[PDB]
Every structure is written in structure tokens, then in C-alpha cells.
């Protein structure tokens, strides 16, 4: 694409600069260019990819929620609907872009459990964002579920219960159950079992790993408190 002439290392370097400047659209374009070099991503590079697109779609989703709320209140001219549709289409485009990167060809080249779970968790997230605005909706929801489920199966087989990627996967799959699948009891069960199994494995961890895991465990507990 437009990053095709820039060195892989320079794209990564500029993605890190863009993050420091809170220029997340730039950051995402740089990381897209880096992915499209065809090489697998390191752990740090996977995090950069995730941070970049998470922040881009996060702004879009928050905008979409504001406009949809106005649109709904208006139903109790076409401008509100039109502009909501404009944001929604740009949001779907970014989701399609990320899902395209995962399908071409990050996932199929990810053989290590940590990278494969990482990308499958991302796939579930971005189908979940598509589901938030969908009204093919059932197929989109099942795509999110299938991606999360494959990631869960690998993570439970290959990674300790305190692993941050596994914990973050479980947190977001539980949110999917609660917010998308209308399965609040499944969400609660998943978050509780995840929290309890990580608690029992904390004793194996260094101080630094302890901090990483307990941070995510607290977010699991926060949601359980909200849900119960």
C-alpha cells in the first residue's frame, strides 16, 4: 500500500513515535504497513498493532454510541441517521481492515500458542465490534464466538491460568457473553472460573508477573461486581 516503500524497522519505529504523540490513526497505518511486509510479528509488535487499532476503533465506537443514542431519542430530518451511518461505515471499514490482516496472513502463520491466541482474541474482538452495530448479525456473532472459542481452547491447553493473554481473552469473551450473546450467566461463570484459577496459580509468579496478572484479575472482579 502507501507504506510499501518504507522499511519494516522504520514503520515499527514510527509506530512507537505515533503512540507517544497519541496519533493512533498514524500508528495503525504504520503497523498495517509492517504487517504487510509479510513477516511474523514479535510480541512487542503484536502489542503495537493491538494498541493502534484499539484506539482508532475505540474513538469510532464511542462516537457511534453518542450518535445512536441521539438517533434513538429522536424516535419517541435524515441528518442524525446519515451521520450515524457515516461513522458506522468507517467503523466497519477499520474492523474489515484488521480482520483482513488477521486472515492475510497473521493467523495461519501463528504456530506458537501465545501469538495464535493473541490473533484469535483480536479476531473475536473485531467481530464483536461489528456485532455491536449489526442489525448477517447472527453470522457475525457466531464468527466472534468461534474465534474466541478457538482461542480459549488453545489457551487452556498451552498457557498457565495467570498468563495475561489468556486472562485478557477470558475477560473479553465474558464481555461478549454478557453484552452480545445475551448470556449473562455464562459471562459470570467464565469470569469467576478465570479469576479463581488465576488466583490459585499466582504463587508461581515473579513480582513483575504477579503485577501483570493481578491487574487483569482486578478488571475481571470489577465486571463481576457490576454484574452481580
Amino acid at each position: 500500500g502507501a507504506m510499501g516503500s518504507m522499511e519494516r524497522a522504520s514503520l515499527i519505529q514510527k509506530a512507537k513515535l505515533a503512540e507517544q504523540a497519541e496519533r493512533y490513526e498514524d500508528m495503525a497505518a504504520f503497523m498495517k504497513g509492517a504487517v504487510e511486509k509479510g513477516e511474523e510479528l514479535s510480541c512487542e509488535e503484536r502489542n503495537l498493532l493491538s494498541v493502534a487499532y484499539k484506539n482508532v476503533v475505540g474513538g469510532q465506537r464511542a462516537a457511534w454510541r453518542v450518535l445512536s443514542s441521539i438517533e434513538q431519542k429522536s424516535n419517541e430530518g435524515p441528518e442524525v441517521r446519515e451521520y450515524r451511518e457515516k461513522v458506522e461505515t468507517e467503523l466497519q471499514g477499520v474492523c474489515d481492515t484488521v480482520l483482513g490482516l488477521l486472515d492475510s496472513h497473521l493467523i495461519k502463520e501463528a504456530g506458537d500458542a501465545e501469538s495464535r491466541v493473541f490473533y484469535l482474541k483480536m479476531k473475536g474482538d473485531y467481530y464483536r465490534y461489528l456485532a455491536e452495530v449489526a442489525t448477517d448479525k447472527k453470522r457475525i456473532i457466531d464468527s466472534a464466538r468461534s474465534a474466541y472459542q478457538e482461542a480459549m481452547d488453545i489457551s487452556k491447553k498451552e498457557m498457565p491460568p495467570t498468563n495475561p493473554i489468556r486472562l485478557g481473552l477470558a475477560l473479553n469473551f465474558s464481555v461478549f457473553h454478557y453484552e452480545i450473546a445475551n448470556s449473562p450467566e455464562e459471562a459470570i461463570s467464565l469470569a469467576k472460573t478465570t479469576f479463581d484459577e488465576a488466583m490459585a496459580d499466582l504463587h508461581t509468579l515473579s513480582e513483575d508477573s504477579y503485577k501483570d496478572s493481578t491487574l487483569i484479575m482486578q478488571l475481571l472482579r470489577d465486571n463481576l461486581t457490576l454484574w452481580t
Partner: peptide
């Protein structure tokens, strides 16, 4: 519900 940041 809040999801996993970053």
C-alpha cells in the same frame, strides 16, 4: 461493560 483496555 468495560473490556480489556489495550
Amino acid at each position: 461493560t468495560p473490556s480489556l483496555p489495550x
